[PDB]
Design an enzyme around this catalytic site. Structure first.
Site, PDB file in Angstrom:
ATOM      1  CD  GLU A  59      52.986  27.720  41.192  1.00  0.00           C
ATOM      2  OE1 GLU A  59      52.633  28.354  42.211  1.00  0.00           O
ATOM      3  OE2 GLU A  59      53.718  26.712  41.235  1.00  0.00           O
ATOM      4  CG  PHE A 121      54.192  13.138  44.920  1.00  0.00           C
ATOM      5  CD1 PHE A 121      53.924  13.630  46.189  1.00  0.00           C
ATOM      6  CD2 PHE A 121      55.276  13.648  44.221  1.00  0.00           C
ATOM      7  CE1 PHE A 121      54.719  14.618  46.745  1.00  0.00           C
ATOM      8  CE2 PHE A 121      56.074  14.632  44.771  1.00  0.00           C
ATOM      9  CZ  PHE A 121      55.796  15.120  46.034  1.00  0.00           C
ATOM     10  CD  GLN A 122      54.143  17.918  43.845  1.00  0.00           C
ATOM     11  OE1 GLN A 122      54.810  17.847  42.811  1.00  0.00           O
ATOM     12  NE2 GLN A 122      54.237  18.937  44.691  1.00  0.00           N
ATOM     13  CE  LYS A 171      58.627  13.236  35.172  1.00  0.00           C
ATOM     14  NZ  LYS A 171      59.316  13.665  36.427  1.00  0.00           N
ATOM     15  CG  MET A 485      34.942  48.784  47.717  1.00  0.00           C
ATOM     16  SD  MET A 485      34.225  50.405  47.353  1.00  0.00           S
ATOM     17  CE  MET A 485      35.299  50.954  46.027  1.00  0.00           C
TER      18      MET A 485
HETATM   19  C1  FAD Z   1      35.250  47.276  42.956  1.00  0.00           C
HETATM   20  C2  FAD Z   1      34.641  47.298  41.548  1.00  0.00           C
HETATM   21  C3  FAD Z   1      33.696  48.267  41.208  1.00  0.00           C
HETATM   22  C4  FAD Z   1      33.151  48.277  39.906  1.00  0.00           C
HETATM   23  N1  FAD Z   1      32.237  49.223  39.585  1.00  0.00           N
HETATM   24  C5  FAD Z   1      31.997  49.421  38.268  1.00  0.00           C
HETATM   25  C6  FAD Z   1      31.350  50.576  37.780  1.00  0.00           C
HETATM   26  O1  FAD Z   1      30.918  51.581  38.663  1.00  0.00           O
HETATM   27  N2  FAD Z   1      31.148  50.711  36.476  1.00  0.00           N
HETATM   28  C7  FAD Z   1      31.551  49.770  35.626  1.00  0.00           C
HETATM   29  O2  FAD Z   1      31.335  49.940  34.259  1.00  0.00           O
HETATM   30  N3  FAD Z   1      32.159  48.669  36.036  1.00  0.00           N
HETATM   31  C8  FAD Z   1      32.392  48.476  37.342  1.00  0.00           C
HETATM   32  N4  FAD Z   1      33.017  47.351  37.735  1.00  0.00           N
HETATM   33  C9  FAD Z   1      33.493  46.387  36.705  1.00  0.00           C
HETATM   34  C10 FAD Z   1      32.442  45.254  36.489  1.00  0.00           C
HETATM   35  O3  FAD Z   1      32.089  44.432  37.606  1.00  0.00           O
HETATM   36  C11 FAD Z   1      32.426  44.578  35.102  1.00  0.00           C
HETATM   37  O4  FAD Z   1      33.666  44.006  34.883  1.00  0.00           O
HETATM   38  C12 FAD Z   1      32.157  45.600  33.995  1.00  0.00           C
HETATM   39  O5  FAD Z   1      31.148  46.477  34.346  1.00  0.00           O
HETATM   40  C13 FAD Z   1      31.705  44.800  32.755  1.00  0.00           C
HETATM   41  O6  FAD Z   1      32.340  45.378  31.620  1.00  0.00           O
HETATM   42  P1  FAD Z   1      31.553  45.178  30.153  1.00  0.00           P
HETATM   43  O7  FAD Z   1      30.094  45.547  30.320  1.00  0.00           O
HETATM   44  O8  FAD Z   1      32.226  46.050  29.123  1.00  0.00           O
HETATM   45  O9  FAD Z   1      31.628  43.570  29.676  1.00  0.00           O
HETATM   46  P2  FAD Z   1      33.040  42.683  29.466  1.00  0.00           P
HETATM   47  O10 FAD Z   1      33.365  41.943  30.746  1.00  0.00           O
HETATM   48  O11 FAD Z   1      34.183  43.592  29.086  1.00  0.00           O
HETATM   49  O12 FAD Z   1      32.761  41.580  28.225  1.00  0.00           O
HETATM   50  C14 FAD Z   1      32.761  42.061  26.871  1.00  0.00           C
HETATM   51  C15 FAD Z   1      31.482  41.913  26.318  1.00  0.00           C
HETATM   52  O13 FAD Z   1      31.522  42.257  24.845  1.00  0.00           O
HETATM   53  C16 FAD Z   1      31.407  41.175  24.107  1.00  0.00           C
HETATM   54  N5  FAD Z   1      32.413  41.194  23.092  1.00  0.00           N
HETATM   55  C17 FAD Z   1      33.668  40.799  23.214  1.00  0.00           C
HETATM   56  N6  FAD Z   1      34.288  40.988  22.051  1.00  0.00           N
HETATM   57  C18 FAD Z   1      33.415  41.517  21.171  1.00  0.00           C
HETATM   58  C19 FAD Z   1      33.457  41.934  19.822  1.00  0.00           C
HETATM   59  N7  FAD Z   1      34.685  41.830  19.044  1.00  0.00           N
HETATM   60  N8  FAD Z   1      32.357  42.422  19.269  1.00  0.00           N
HETATM   61  C20 FAD Z   1      31.223  42.533  19.944  1.00  0.00           C
HETATM   62  N9  FAD Z   1      31.147  42.152  21.212  1.00  0.00           N
HETATM   63  C21 FAD Z   1      32.216  41.647  21.842  1.00  0.00           C
HETATM   64  C22 FAD Z   1      31.560  39.853  25.086  1.00  0.00           C
HETATM   65  O14 FAD Z   1      30.734  38.747  24.561  1.00  0.00           O
HETATM   66  C23 FAD Z   1      30.993  40.394  26.386  1.00  0.00           C
HETATM   67  O15 FAD Z   1      29.494  40.372  26.349  1.00  0.00           O
HETATM   68  C24 FAD Z   1      33.549  47.330  38.982  1.00  0.00           C
HETATM   69  C25 FAD Z   1      34.501  46.349  39.324  1.00  0.00           C
HETATM   70  C26 FAD Z   1      35.042  46.341  40.613  1.00  0.00           C
HETATM   71  C27 FAD Z   1      36.080  45.285  41.001  1.00  0.00           C
HETATM   72  C1  AUJ Z   2      41.388  38.288  46.662  1.00  0.00           C
HETATM   73  C2  AUJ Z   2      40.295  39.202  47.177  1.00  0.00           C
HETATM   74  N1  AUJ Z   2      39.927  39.131  48.431  1.00  0.00           N
HETATM   75  C3  AUJ Z   2      38.906  39.969  48.961  1.00  0.00           C
HETATM   76  C4  AUJ Z   2      38.299  40.866  48.159  1.00  0.00           C
HETATM   77  C5  AUJ Z   2      37.199  41.766  48.695  1.00  0.00           C
HETATM   78  N2  AUJ Z   2      37.544  43.145  48.656  1.00  0.00           N
HETATM   79  C6  AUJ Z   2      37.030  44.097  47.731  1.00  0.00           C
HETATM   80  C7  AUJ Z   2      35.743  43.990  46.938  1.00  0.00           C
HETATM   81  C8  AUJ Z   2      35.362  45.366  46.436  1.00  0.00           C
HETATM   82  O1  AUJ Z   2      35.918  43.126  45.844  1.00  0.00           O
HETATM   83  O2  AUJ Z   2      34.714  43.520  47.776  1.00  0.00           O
HETATM   84  O3  AUJ Z   2      33.984  42.331  47.327  1.00  0.00           O
HETATM   85  S1  AUJ Z   2      38.089  45.509  47.699  1.00  0.00           S
HETATM   86  C9  AUJ Z   2      38.875  44.978  49.184  1.00  0.00           C
HETATM   87  C10 AUJ Z   2      39.876  45.795  49.957  1.00  0.00           C
HETATM   88  C11 AUJ Z   2      40.890  46.398  49.020  1.00  0.00           C
HETATM   89  O4  AUJ Z   2      42.018  46.741  49.777  1.00  0.00           O
HETATM   90  P1  AUJ Z   2      43.092  47.682  49.111  1.00  0.00           P
HETATM   91  O5  AUJ Z   2      44.031  46.902  48.268  1.00  0.00           O
HETATM   92  O6  AUJ Z   2      44.013  48.237  50.129  1.00  0.00           O
HETATM   93  O7  AUJ Z   2      42.376  48.802  48.254  1.00  0.00           O
HETATM   94  P2  AUJ Z   2      41.661  50.109  48.793  1.00  0.00           P
HETATM   95  O8  AUJ Z   2      42.065  51.293  48.001  1.00  0.00           O
HETATM   96  O9  AUJ Z   2      42.109  50.488  50.153  1.00  0.00           O
HETATM   97  O10 AUJ Z   2      40.090  49.914  48.747  1.00  0.00           O
HETATM   98  C12 AUJ Z   2      38.463  43.750  49.563  1.00  0.00           C
HETATM   99  C13 AUJ Z   2      38.923  43.108  50.850  1.00  0.00           C
HETATM  100  C14 AUJ Z   2      38.735  40.926  46.715  1.00  0.00           C
HETATM  101  N3  AUJ Z   2      38.132  41.841  45.821  1.00  0.00           N
HETATM  102  N4  AUJ Z   2      39.680  40.131  46.292  1.00  0.00           N
HETATM  103  C1  LIG Z   3      60.144  14.457  45.585  1.00  0.00           C
HETATM  104  O1  LIG Z   3      59.705  13.680  44.508  1.00  0.00           O
HETATM  105  C2  LIG Z   3      59.890  14.284  43.260  1.00  0.00           C
HETATM  106  N1  LIG Z   3      60.536  15.433  43.171  1.00  0.00           N
HETATM  107  C3  LIG Z   3      60.712  16.005  41.992  1.00  0.00           C
HETATM  108  C4  LIG Z   3      61.457  17.332  41.874  1.00  0.00           C
HETATM  109  N2  LIG Z   3      60.242  15.426  40.908  1.00  0.00           N
HETATM  110  C5  LIG Z   3      59.599  14.278  40.996  1.00  0.00           C
HETATM  111  N3  LIG Z   3      59.095  13.689  39.775  1.00  0.00           N
HETATM  112  C6  LIG Z   3      58.297  12.480  39.724  1.00  0.00           C
HETATM  113  O2  LIG Z   3      58.001  11.859  40.694  1.00  0.00           O
HETATM  114  N4  LIG Z   3      57.871  12.051  38.413  1.00  0.00           N
HETATM  115  S1  LIG Z   3      56.933  10.652  38.186  1.00  0.00           S
HETATM  116  O3  LIG Z   3      57.741   9.445  38.365  1.00  0.00           O
HETATM  117  O4  LIG Z   3      56.545  10.548  36.774  1.00  0.00           O
HETATM  118  C7  LIG Z   3      55.465  10.608  39.256  1.00  0.00           C
HETATM  119  C8  LIG Z   3      55.043   9.383  39.749  1.00  0.00           C
HETATM  120  C9  LIG Z   3      53.926   9.304  40.560  1.00  0.00           C
HETATM  121  C10 LIG Z   3      53.227  10.455  40.879  1.00  0.00           C
HETATM  122  C11 LIG Z   3      53.646  11.679  40.386  1.00  0.00           C
HETATM  123  C12 LIG Z   3      54.766  11.766  39.571  1.00  0.00           C
HETATM  124  O5  LIG Z   3      55.202  13.004  39.071  1.00  0.00           O
HETATM  125  C13 LIG Z   3      54.325  14.087  39.216  1.00  0.00           C
HETATM  126  C14 LIG Z   3      54.589  14.873  40.507  1.00  0.00           C
HETATM  127 CL1  LIG Z   3      56.337  14.994  40.853  1.00  0.00          CL
HETATM  128  N5  LIG Z   3      59.417  13.703  42.172  1.00  0.00           N
END
Ligand code: FAD
Ligand code: AUJ
Ligand code: A1AUE
Ligand code: FAD
Ligand code: AUJ
Ligand code: A1AUE
Ligand code: MG
Ligand code: MG
Ligand code: MG
Ligand code: MG
Lengths: 582, 582
Positions: A59, A121-122, A171, A485
């Site tokens: 998922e 359940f679940q 459900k 990183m």
């Molecule tokens: C490992 C790593 C390194 C990073 N290093 C950098 C880096 O060196 N540089 C960098 O830039 N980022 C970096 N980031 C990314 C970072 O952390 C942020 O995601 C990014 O900087 C934020 O982008 P933004 O400022 O455009 O805001 P966004 O997250 O893109 O949000 C959009 C903004 O615009 C506004 N907005 C949305 N729609 C509209 C509209 N129609 N009109 C007007 N406003 C609107 C929203 O309200 C919000 O304030 C890094 C990320 C990672 C994972």
């Molecule tokens: C779910 C998740 N778990 C751990 C993370 C913490 N981080 C990172 C960071 C920057 O967010 O540090 O905060 S990057 C990173 C390692 C990336 O391994 P690679 O995919 O091989 O890429 P590369 O080219 O080698 O660098 C880790 C462990 C993360 N972000 N997501």
């Molecule tokens: C192995 O048990 C099983 N397997 C499968 C593939 N399906 C279902 N379905 C089901 O239990 N439906 S329910 O009576 O409404 C229900 C009653 C009580 C609590 C939960 C619940 O459902 C939500 C989660 Cl399944 N159960």
């Protein structure tokens, strides 16, 4: 005019009401993984002829694919999961979509209403779990509310600042028969009364005025500009202001353009960060002043008049206090300012060639650079070759880490929504499922997941999804055998002391582990490994020319460092421009 | 068959829909104080011919009057307030009704829906404030929901364990025109599926069995028995088990009865606490084992088989762990057990005369006692005289403190719902407005507020309500010039060091301050003061014989102590039986 599969007076299950509610929103693709609590929804999906389901293998892959679908198309991404363990597997993607402002509608099955709160359940109280990591969420308590709540979810997810909305559906509500009313009004009076109005000429005139009075203006564009590509381009023609872009804004203004300063921030170019450092007018369009970009807030654009245009009133003045502010859609603000700039063209006489020349001096003294060691493949070079062989027209998704930065630095995105990357949350494992969603949304595009070996293996199970759905997803795996990183920070700040960043097998230390080619083989996906820089160009070409999915394992020396680097909370004077793990 | 004042196809304001929703619940009296956010509701109330409004002078008086109405009648009490400061003035009464399980429906006006969350004029997030001090609450977000939500509120307030429900109604919903649907089904599937079932014969047989095998059985009855007066009385005939009562249970079994052990607990009789201490079978019917009753839980009924019958599954085993438990209505459990006891009468041969005689020895060695000093009026004696002159048939409300305990100890309540007192929260100022509600609900009854001088002055403004509504409310004011109960603890545990417990004027230390007679005179209420014990009997008689309201200021020596006293968290061996503040 919509055509229902049921008579207007014919009762159907709530699950059929929900699916038709999706059809009436124009939904064509969902990413749904079945379970007990959502079986009815899945049965109703098979009865729909207009909605296709892409079954992921996890998922988290489902929600990340919905993100890639949304980020690459501008449409909302829809994922569906069962109760309990299905719902909790969505959580990383919900938080990811909220921090990056991605429009998303997540539907979760739930236990029957009377079972809620009994540790059934679940059962997971997913509405409580996800309240702080969604824009809004719902627990549907009556089958009559399905049309209204689905409509409100899509409206909230896509309007204003986009974000994820979760809809929890017990459900028994899915099984209950009812006659839907598609004419119900939405119950969002507070939200709708606070939606930003079109920008007033009062505020737009003042901005154009500040532009004519400035000598060092810098555009600072971000994810909010993804729908303003044409308006921003016209704005740059009329002003000649250089454009610095955030990670989320990449491609809003073309990277291979003369006025492009490319990315700013922690790993931004020296000249982009220089421009902002010495600017007198900062046009902050669609940005949120996050810490990666600004570093020390007091030092960020310390001598600039800051104009901040944002659609979210809560972002204006949150970290950096602007001089002029406009709460509205930056698309409309650009259109209004373009009219004023075009009329008063001969009157304003805008020319920043002196400022542009000062920046182009920094651009030639401190460009992006990488080193080639023998026949080892530089990761930066591999991305440049991909850019060339795809003509900069590929949709690029990434994991998180060094490869993500290099994918941002060394690919010239020409349009927004070619760049699909997790920026705010920075969730590893995003790249492969995001490419799945982008390919489903853009079936004629070149889609390449530029992934790291740590990030790629987290959701490696989605290779089965790619084969089964026969999606032409290309994987450019930059394999450095490390969590790169984190390894880089170990080298800089912890004397290269390794704390669980090596991803290979220490018993066979010089062997590439795992063998990603066999992961692809397990799912019937053709693959190859390249190690010599001389072979890289033909290998990438083979990946592109081979129809359908393809994985290219690109071996890279792990001692590479992403440069430049402004340390966290630092200033421009702290920028690191040289060094690696050697 | 209900008769609406509007045509079934005629749109009316939501406020008129809400008032008719009250009419359809059988509501005849509300306690409503107007304000801007509830003006529409008040206009709609004047259009109702079946609902009368009693305008209090403070919303806390309104909610406490609704409590007195409910506690004295078994019907739900209804109070209405405006937004903001009106709503927050209800809070003490909401918490009071929840802790004492009083059925209450509180309606608050609210700012228009679009203004919610904007710090609007007189806005309070009352649903958030009161969530933890109500059984349930609602924020109405559409005029269509008014019939359903009002019906659910009354159902939740009166079914199961009774409690308060708050309904928050935005002003725009009150003005919106709509055609109500009175046939909507309630959305309480979880609550209704967990409502206790009739008690099985399996559990009832085991209890009767434990009774026949026990030699020292004690009935422990509380507020849950207020509707089981006949069944409990029949149960005592068939078993001969002595009855110990909580503060909330007083009158369920007649106090002036031979088998009555009167009240148990911190200020319970020595013989009631003795019976529970040495019992082998504790029949805990409609009680919640609170700390005032039990003291140290491990020592409470340490050698008894504990049978706990409660309608709230969450109370069973919360503090004391029972041997046998029945989750259901104690009225039905008594009826089922009475059948078994009546059939197996000659077979069971129940006789606890040996146990009853052991208790009647304690009853004669350690009865409730008070001391008469000269001509000073003992407060205990004043209540005994009131009991005599009213023949134990008066409805009694109280404040909180020493006078409350003496009103519980020295008045023989013959039926439940004669005793209206705040037990769980213990809110001063309850007595006067509660008497207002009891008198409106029982206009032919003798209603006496046995109040303290601290408690009486807190809501003294409701004297205006009493006069204007021409309610025959009698006030028996036990005036000791002190916060008596806190003063008693100062004497016992803090060496009589006074920390702000004197309520008079220290400049005129020997003057009765304030002059409560002039408070009554200000509101046209006849009043008198009595100081000599010889004059007390005629003064109370005058209060009773004088038609309409009357205040009797009964001056009492402040050094009186409520006895006996088991210290908080103590055991029966720690009971204090003598001493006062002299
Ligand atoms: C490992 C790593 C390194 C990073 N290093 C950098 C880096 O060196 N540089 C960098 O830039 N980022 C970096 N980031 C990314 C970072 O952390 C942020 O995601 C990014 O900087 C934020 O982008 P933004 O400022 O455009 O805001 P966004 O997250 O893109 O949000 C959009 C903004 O615009 C506004 N907005 C949305 N729609 C509209 C509209 N129609 N009109 C007007 N406003 C609107 C929203 O309200 C919000 O304030 C890094 C990320 C990672 C994972
Ligand atoms: C779910 C998740 N778990 C751990 C993370 C913490 N981080 C990172 C960071 C920057 O967010 O540090 O905060 S990057 C990173 C390692 C990336 O391994 P690679 O995919 O091989 O890429 P590369 O080219 O080698 O660098 C880790 C462990 C993360 N972000 N997501
Ligand atoms: C192995 O048990 C099983 N397997 C499968 C593939 N399906 C279902 N379905 C089901 O239990 N439906 S329910 O009576 O409404 C229900 C009653 C009580 C609590 C939960 C619940 O459902 C939500 C989660 Cl399944 N159960
Ligand atoms: C100053 C002061 C001193 C006090 N000292 C004492 C004292 O010495 N002795 C004393 O007894 N109290 C004393 N109290 C009162 C006290 O704090 C509690 O309010 C009281 O003891 C609890 O009463 P209860 O056990 O009957 O439970 P209640 O508060 O009356 O609740 C009723 C219980 O019965 C259950 N119930 C309700 N309806 C039904 C039904 N139809 N069938 C079955 N079960 C049902 C409910 O779920 C709940 O568990 C004092 C209060 C004050 C202010
Ligand atoms: C809103 C409120 N504020 C303060 C309270 C704390 N208490 C009390 C207690 C037992 O709850 O102590 O916790 S009793 C009490 C004093 C009672 O003054 P009196 O009315 O004159 O009656 P008396 O016959 O003289 O004893 C105080 C101050 C209270 N319960 N309610
Ligand atoms: C002195 O102001 C005054 N006085 C009186 C007697 N009544 C009203 N009524 C009123 O303001 N109604 S409202 O437009 O819907 C409204 C709008 C915004 C915020 C609140 C609000 O009402 C709720 C609280 Cl009054 N105002
Ligand atoms: Mg090279
Ligand atoms: Mg790596
Ligand atoms: Mg006497
Ligand atoms: Mg007093």
């Amino acid at each position: 005019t919509f055509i229902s599969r049921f008579a207007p007076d014919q009762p159907r299950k709530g699950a059929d009401i929900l699916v038709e509610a999706l059809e009436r929103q124009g939904v064509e693709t969902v990413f749904a993984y079945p379970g007990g609590a959502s079986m009815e929804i899945h049965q109703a999906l098979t009865r729909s002829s207009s909605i296709r389901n892409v079954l992921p293998r996890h998922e988290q892959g489902g929600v990340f694919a919905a993100e890639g679908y949304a980020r690459s198309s501008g449409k909302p991404g829809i994922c569906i999961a069962t109760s309990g363990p299905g719902a909790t597997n969505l959580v990383s993607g919900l938080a990811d979509a909220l921090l990056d402002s991605v429009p998303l509608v997540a539907i979760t099955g739930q236990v029957p209403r009377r079972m809620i709160g009994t540790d059934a359940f679940q059962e997971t109280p997913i509405v409580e779990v996800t309240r702080s990591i969604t824009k809004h969420n719902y627990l549907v308590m009556d089958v009559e509310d399905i049309p209204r709540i689905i409509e409100e979810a899509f409206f909230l997810a896509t309007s204003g600042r986009p974000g994820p909305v979760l809809v929890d559906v017990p459900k028994d509500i899915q099984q209950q028969l009812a006659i839907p009313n598609w004419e119900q009004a939405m119950r969002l009076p507070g939200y709708m009364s606070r939606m930003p109005k079109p920008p007033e000429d009062s505020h737009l005139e003042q901005i154009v005025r500040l532009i004519s009075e400035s000598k060092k203006p810098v555009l600072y564009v971000g994810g909010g500009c993804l729908n303003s590509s044409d308006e921003l381009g016209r704005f740059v023609e009329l002003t000649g202001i250089p454009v610095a872009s955030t990670l989320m804004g990449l491609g809003s203004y073309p990277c291979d353009d003369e006025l492009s300063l490319h990315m700013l921030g922690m790993h931004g170019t020296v000249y982009a960060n220089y421009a902002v450092e010495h600017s007198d007018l900062l046009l902050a369009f669609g940005v949120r002043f996050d810490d990666r970009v600004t570093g020390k807030l007091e030092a960020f654009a310390s001598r600039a008049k800051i104009v901040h245009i944002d659609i979210d009133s809560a972002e204006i003045g949150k970290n950096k206090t602007p001089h002029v502010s406009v709460c509205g859609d930056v698309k409309l603000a650009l259109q209004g300012m373009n009219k004023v700039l075009e009329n008063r063209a001969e009157e304003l006489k805008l020319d920043f060639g002196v400022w542009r020349n000062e920046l182009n001096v920094q651009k030639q003294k401190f460009p992006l650079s990488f080193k080639t060691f023998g026949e080892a493949i530089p990761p930066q070079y591999a991305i440049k070759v991909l850019d060339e062989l795809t003509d900069g027209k590929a949709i690029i998704s990434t994991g998180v880490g060094q490869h993500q930065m290099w994918a941002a630095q060394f690919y010239n995105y020409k349009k927004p929504r070619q760049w699909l990357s997790s920026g705010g949350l920075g969730a590893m494992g995003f790249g492969l499922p995001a490419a799945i969603g982008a390919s489903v949304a853009n079936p004629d595009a070149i889609v390449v997941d530029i992934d790291g070996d740590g990030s790629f293996i987290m959701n490696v199970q989605e290779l089965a999804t790619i084969r089964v759905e026969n999606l032409p997803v290309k994987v450019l795996l930059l394999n450095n055998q490390h969590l790169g990183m984190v390894m880089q920070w170990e080298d800089r700040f912890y004397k290269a002391n390794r704390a669980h960043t090596f991803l290979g097998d220490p018993a066979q230390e010089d062997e590439i582990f795992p063998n990603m080619l066999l992961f692809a083989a397990a799912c019937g996906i053709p693959a190859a490994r390249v190690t010599k820089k001389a072979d890289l160009r033909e290998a990438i070409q083979t990946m592109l020319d081979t129809p359908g999915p393809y994985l290219l394992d690109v071996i890279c020396p792990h001692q590479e460092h992403v440069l430049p680097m402004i340390p966290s909370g630092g200033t421009f004077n702290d920028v690191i421009t040289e060094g690696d793990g050697r």
